[PDB]
Amino acid sequence: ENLWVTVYYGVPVWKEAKTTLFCASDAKAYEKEVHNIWATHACVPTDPNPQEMVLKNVTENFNMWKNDMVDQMHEDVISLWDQSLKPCVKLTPLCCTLNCTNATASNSSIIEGMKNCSFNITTELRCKREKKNALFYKLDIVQLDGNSSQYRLINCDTSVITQVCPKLSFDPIPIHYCAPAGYAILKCNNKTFTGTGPCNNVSTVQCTHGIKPVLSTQLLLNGSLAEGEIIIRSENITKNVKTIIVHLNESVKIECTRPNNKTRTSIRIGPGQAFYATGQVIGDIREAYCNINESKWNETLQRVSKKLKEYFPHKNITFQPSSGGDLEITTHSFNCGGEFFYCNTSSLFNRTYMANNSTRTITIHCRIKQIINMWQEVGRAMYAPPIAGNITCISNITGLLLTRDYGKNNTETFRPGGGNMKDNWRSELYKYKVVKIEPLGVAPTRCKRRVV
Amino acid sequence: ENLWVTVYYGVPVWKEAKTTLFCASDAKAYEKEVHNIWATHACVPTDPNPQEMVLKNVTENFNMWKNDMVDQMHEDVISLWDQSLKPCVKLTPLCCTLNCTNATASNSSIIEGMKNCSFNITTELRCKREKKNALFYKLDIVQLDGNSSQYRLINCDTSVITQVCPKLSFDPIPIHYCAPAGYAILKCNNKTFTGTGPCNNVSTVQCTHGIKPVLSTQLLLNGSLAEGEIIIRSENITKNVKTIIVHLNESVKIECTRPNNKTRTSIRIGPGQAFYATGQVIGDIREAYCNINESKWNETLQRVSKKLKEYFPHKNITFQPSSGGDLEITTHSFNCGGEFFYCNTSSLFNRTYMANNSTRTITIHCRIKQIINMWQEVGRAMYAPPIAGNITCISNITGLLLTRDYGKNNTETFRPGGGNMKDNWRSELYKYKVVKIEPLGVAPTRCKRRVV
Amino acid sequence: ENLWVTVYYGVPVWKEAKTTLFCASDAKAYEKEVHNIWATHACVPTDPNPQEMVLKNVTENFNMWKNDMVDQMHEDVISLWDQSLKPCVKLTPLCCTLNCTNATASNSSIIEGMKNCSFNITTELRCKREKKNALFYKLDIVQLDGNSSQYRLINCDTSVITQVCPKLSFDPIPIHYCAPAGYAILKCNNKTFTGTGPCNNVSTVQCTHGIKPVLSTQLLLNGSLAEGEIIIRSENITKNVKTIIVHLNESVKIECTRPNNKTRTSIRIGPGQAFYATGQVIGDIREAYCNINESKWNETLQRVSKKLKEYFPHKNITFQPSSGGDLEITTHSFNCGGEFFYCNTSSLFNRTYMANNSTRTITIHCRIKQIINMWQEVGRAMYAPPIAGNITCISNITGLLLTRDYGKNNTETFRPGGGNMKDNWRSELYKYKVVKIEPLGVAPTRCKRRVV
Amino acid sequence: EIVLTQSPATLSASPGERVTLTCRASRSVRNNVAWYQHKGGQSPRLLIYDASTRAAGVPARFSGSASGTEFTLAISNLESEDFTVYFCLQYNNWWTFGQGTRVDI
Amino acid sequence: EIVLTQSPATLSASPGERVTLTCRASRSVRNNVAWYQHKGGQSPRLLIYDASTRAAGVPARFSGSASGTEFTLAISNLESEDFTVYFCLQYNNWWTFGQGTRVDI
Amino acid sequence: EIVLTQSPATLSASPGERVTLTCRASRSVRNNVAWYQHKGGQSPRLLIYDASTRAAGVPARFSGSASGTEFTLAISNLESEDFTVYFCLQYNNWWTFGQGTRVDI
Amino acid sequence: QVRLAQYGGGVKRLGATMTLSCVASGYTFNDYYIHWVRQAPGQGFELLGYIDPANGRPDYAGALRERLSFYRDKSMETLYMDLRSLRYDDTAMYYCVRNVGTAGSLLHYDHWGSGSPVIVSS
Amino acid sequence: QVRLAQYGGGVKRLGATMTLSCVASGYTFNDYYIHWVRQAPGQGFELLGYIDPANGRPDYAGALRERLSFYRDKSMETLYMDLRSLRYDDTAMYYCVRNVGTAGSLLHYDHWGSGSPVIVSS
Amino acid sequence: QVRLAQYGGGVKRLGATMTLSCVASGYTFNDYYIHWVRQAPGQGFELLGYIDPANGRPDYAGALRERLSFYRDKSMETLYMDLRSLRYDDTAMYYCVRNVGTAGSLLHYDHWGSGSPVIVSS
């Protein structure tokens, strides 16, 4: 009895909303003066330590598929890539038909994945036509009609090509995302979380942990690891799904190399503009390749199958190589050092299962490429200048982007896929959700205000 | 007796000021996902219904000539046109000398409004120089000196030419203008309002009604209609005036067509862009033309004279065609479908008057043009790609942009004019005025505040 | 006894901080509608009179070397030059190899500082080339290898060249700098101030006095004058210093001329734009030159020495010409009218000293140049079109940018230097410092607040 | 392979009547079912999806509902437009269609 | 055609005197009238417009006023600058000029 | 020319010991003095500047101090890294270096 | 707004190979999966498979995995379906169809192309 | 700042045709109307007509509408006046003159060009 | 990050002239002064002079002002030291070295190049 309205300001209560997050970073590169394609372009100073607060007695929903910030990650990474490529040289004067022949080196009367070529150019603008020569990995090139000595760069037909300036680095840096004032970010700390439904152990932060913007396909690499045993995340509107994300509790090492020496050459294009064509290949010629501990691979796919049959309770599971489409999805792909790789993963995925460490070492063939589509756009493409000398690289596999075949009697089947870059960031942003605080609460109370 | 100062906050009082209005729109095109040159570029979400409040007992001044927002309309329309044309292709490779000859229709020695032409082009950079051919409406082209087979595009001496991308549409959409917070917009609802002096029936809104950004000259079309009988708006500093706006209380229909079939063709400019040159004309040839109900035209000009003699009380009034200058003012002009028209309106304006519906149908000759100046700038010009096939169009005449001749004994005379695009928006923004609220009022009162 | 906390808001107290100052100007040019490279680009309306308040009984520190706003002056001037040059035409079509010969005029069978040249150009774009000719001051040009008739523009190897549009003017205007709200600017009014340590007569303003952004080297000109006798400002971390600024209490007039008549010629680049090449030289040929009152020069260097020996108490002081490096520092340089000058100041600086007005008039040889490095950046060179006819100019010397030699027995030595443009603005911004107000003060008081 | 059965194969009706069409699945498909009108010799059109959401621009006379393994399409007013073929589709697992149903006079 | 009459045709004055010039119209021109100085053999210059607004940079010694169909220009100090021709112009309807007036010693 | 003298020319020490090196100037150089390690046959490295500021990435075992015309470098733990040459440098007036000092077993 | 035009329909010789084709317009070509579906006369509709236009990934019905292939000329917003080794029972109407989906799941169809008839007999 | 330079002045033959010309600078060429005005010796000033430089629209005095024509080379900020069929009484000083106006009305003149004399006699 | 690479080191003939060279990378080339310093065997380090790379201004030790010269190819981030008229005692290690400074004063050195040995004997 005897109750009246009262207003409380600052009441801790919230609702879900779309909101513009801040890009945040270590304040200059890895806290260093180096030039790097992410953190050298703005993205504000360091979070020294995220001030995580664990909420008592909160039950709250999360939905990693319908998430409001993955789109912003996708746009922001694209924006940094656009802003950083924009000043660099457009290779447009290079784009006309090349004469080409078999490429070679001393004690290598062929280099097989490759072609030697020569082309018309102008060394200074409105000066005389001039001839220069270089070799290209064959995948950068198309052959014009007939038996044909005539070839062209694969994208300069359809799109403008920009050379990425050799001053930059492709290296990822640990980016952070932060709330603007009056928004808040929630983590969901339950160590078994499948990416949808309620969480029962929840905490808030002004910013995410670090995320590394690694471009990759088929294999999630240099990412986080799951806290439980292996977690399998899918949508659950339908058995039909675009991607399944498998998140490992144990990293599998992969090592890779481009062992041939590269002779960089400089061909002028204009005032302060130089194109780093790929000159003579040096050393005892090999393919690019990668290596894996076969014990760890077998254990990993056994564990993955042993979890995956919990979603799919009928008898048989099977893995296979890619069905078809572009190199970008039909192979595993990544950017070790400063060149792009494409690996025929078929020997990793020939495996089968049913109801009821430096030995046997797996090694895989890789091709490499200089002309690259990004974000699956068209009309713009990137040329990678050659990295001089020879290259070694090591990274951690952390998860698989699977997709599932047609369902048939007693038999599921899966293969590597994904390739749409959003699924990489969704494979790590699955934790977070963003909310707006609505602080102006009202309630009944056993009081009234004096009139005097 | 016994009076002291008091402050009232939020007092409803205002003064006139220049202020930056918001562009507002239906939230995506006509509430649709289509690509349109206005609403697809920003301009914020829909006003579902303007919350008009009629003010009791307000007398307030309006001045449509000295108005503070017409300039912003002019700048904003230009801005949208700049922002939307900027990504589309520059026809820069095309501009050097053409060779040309009489074009031909089927069965025919000729086609009269056009010239056939062929030209050197560069195609993909430093591939072979190559020859291509097209026909142009004669008005797009200048003949170089002498008896001369030699010709050039009319504008590209002076200017960059941009081809508008065929993805877009020239269609108007109903734009709205809205006040920022603390400004307010007043309408003046008096159904007889001449555009200057006091109004006695006034209302306020957060936003204007819709306005359609129609490019036209001589004739105001697809606009609003006056609420009374015909209204004639002029400046009143002097009998000399730049323009007179005549605003009709009854729309007169006009219908138009380009009945010939156009063969679109694609010529490659470079690494993604096609020049949509104009290929062979198909079908039984006609001019472009437009049609009007001659009864309604005669009644309209009778009514216009019957009002106009109230401003000019002496014995005679007369109409005539344009005196001289560019096509853009010497003819009626508009952009039906996706090409630009220029019509010799002389048969509409041969009329005389003095002191004391599908019959006789008027039809008028029109030419059509691909190369266009906008806003009467120079140094930039628009190329319209041909609309393929054939075109029909209908629109509503709503007002006349007159200008007055030298005044002579017992005789006024008027002819079509305007052409400076500001007068089109002033022919509909004449209603509104913008004000800033000055809410901090003070007054005497029979009170003082306690010291305790 | 009996003391409690209280808060005072608005307390006048401050700390030093980096903060973004406003660019401020006379509201359009010199309060005129003329087109000028500073004030026509934004920079807000006039301060009618700075509201200077002298602070009673304030002692406060100033440090002109470590100053927080000189960097912003440098960036802002760069920004205005970039924003104003960006729309003007790139001379890139001109850059291919020139053929050249000795330049001449009627009754001048040589003009010695100069070369006549002819070149291939593309008069209408992507069609037939043409030969055109012009003459250049020799310093704009480099000779390609051998005995060689072959030459190139000095910078277009390394850098884009933009022609500054003849519509603009290089003239300085009196720019002002102003604090954003809650920051404040302090002047230091002590008439003897050396640029570092405490000041005892201090005042505050919303804005600086006017500063003229004069590009010059060796000699500070059209600047302010010192209030005392001559002031010498240096850093004092070490006897080693990059620059010494000498600030005069008395202007010394300098007068200059380019007495030869220039024939401007117009060569088309493409759509609307033209290269204003330098055509035939007219009149009785002379060098460019400058003149000074030798009495005033001798008195000035006597006074400068007579102060400078107070910092350097041992016996001998001496002046010398430049040691080496680019023209920009090895000579005095300035931009009279609209062309750039470079003067061999060696006859001004041959002087010596030790322990214990239109007569003898000094005149000095000057070369002049069209192709210019700016802010000492590479990559972004500038071309000045010729000023037609002939030119006279007058300006006020106000200070010397000295630098000091190796210290040797009983003997200091100095020569002209500086050239890094920051030292010019630091030679006038030495007065000001910027602070943030921290208005939320707290203190003890003999009060407590009532609980009721 | 999830089967859909439509019933009836052909439905007898008169103009302006309310009319009901039925579809059943060999096992659960949740609500992940849709209905299409198929005008003779023409590209089909979407009516309803998730067994219940009428799509944009579809006539308000169409409606639908579900219970377990069974799905129902209704039309409030038959017309010469609607004396035509219709089919159910499921997208829960794999895609599969019913045999279609014709509505006639 | 709106006529302007100036009076006098020639005005006798001495340096440093205050001096007044007059213009009349055949009917009303509101205040839409201006005055110009015409130095011998040179492009004229604007003094006053709207019968009363002294233009920018014009000497303060010039002033003007109106009453009905009549317009007045005045100068506070004659000088060798100002022993010269002046004319009134109306811009109410069309444009027309007076016959001009000369001021002399 | 400001002279620097280092002392000793050679310093006898054992690993893990704290060790001290000294430098003196012919007249005052304020604190404008620095110390460098010179590994055999290699580009030197900065240790300390302004007689007291340890540079970034330098081992914490190095430290230094000053009094009038005299400057002191100290190392808390000798090692095979540090049985090597070191020199003082002054930048108060002109630049000049000491004769260097070697630390050995 | 949107369309799916089609071509390639007609009489085909017994045992031959055909390429049918579909041309999109009016929407963001990377965002929607395309499905190929058919109807033999007197039979209910049947799915052949689907293709992601963005990366060109195909997926096929288990009965036809040997015979079908899909590819796209991405710059042309254009898709192609090969069916190898035709048989009499492939005689049908063939459609390309647009499929809606969230980032997680493919769902119902929202637009059907014009349809191409094919008749298998020499 | 602003100028109106002129040319074309000189002796002209009886009954001939002439083009006089005027060149503007220092202001936004589209914003101001230009008027052509003349003075015969011993007569008050007279208006020939005006031209809007932006669109090239002319208006003429009723006495001379048959004989005059105006046009502009807009990229050159340059105006031309034709007077056809000269007579002895066209002997005069001719000026181009700048006219101020609001968006509504054209008002006083604010700047006069250098003036071109013309003498009509063979 | 930063480097100062060097070249030009080797045997040189008695009384000859040499150019040594130094190549920078990894930092803003205009911001830091470069000093040229040497060590003869059995002697303490010695300064030859310094150069501002931005404007190319040189400065010299008083003993060597006649013999030295410095210049830079600024677009190549590259510096050159000429020493004219070599003598036996110029036999030394030569370094280019980076010098920190505020806007007011040059201070300590923070990075040494790789070093070039020179031997003066025919």
Side-chain angles (χ1 to χ4, degrees), chain A residues 334-355:
Chain A
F334 60 92
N335 68 344
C336 275
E339 291 189 48
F340 293 84
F341 295 72
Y342 295 84
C343 303
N344 187 323
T345 50
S346 56
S347 59
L348 288 162
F349 288 96
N350 273 261
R351 279 301 196 177
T352 60
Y353 301 105
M354 64 291 297

Side-chain angles (χ1 to χ4, degrees), chain F residues 19-78:
Chain F
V19 171
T20 301
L21 299 87
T22 75
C23 180
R24 285 199 294 275
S26 60
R27 65 175 181 259
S28 179
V29 296
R30 307 174 184 183
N31 302 320
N32 313 127
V33 174
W35 287 101
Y36 298 77
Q37 185 174 76
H38 189 184
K39 288 186 169 74
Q42 295 156 69
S43 307
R45 284 176 66 251
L46 174 63
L47 298 178
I48 284 169
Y49 62 91
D50 299 339
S52 59
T53 299
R54 188 188 306 97
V58 175
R61 63 180 189 255
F62 296 105
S63 65
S65 63
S67 178
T69 61
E70 183 161 51
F71 308 88
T72 301
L73 165 69
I75 323 176
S76 71
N77 283 262
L78 249 291

Side-chain angles (χ1 to χ4, degrees), chain G residues 5-6 15 21-22 30 33 39-40 51 55 62 79 81 86 103 113:
Chain G
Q6 306 188 195
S21 67
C22 175
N30 297 308
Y33 280 31
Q39 177 165 48
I51 175 166
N55 57 28
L79 301 101
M81 166 168 66
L86 289 166

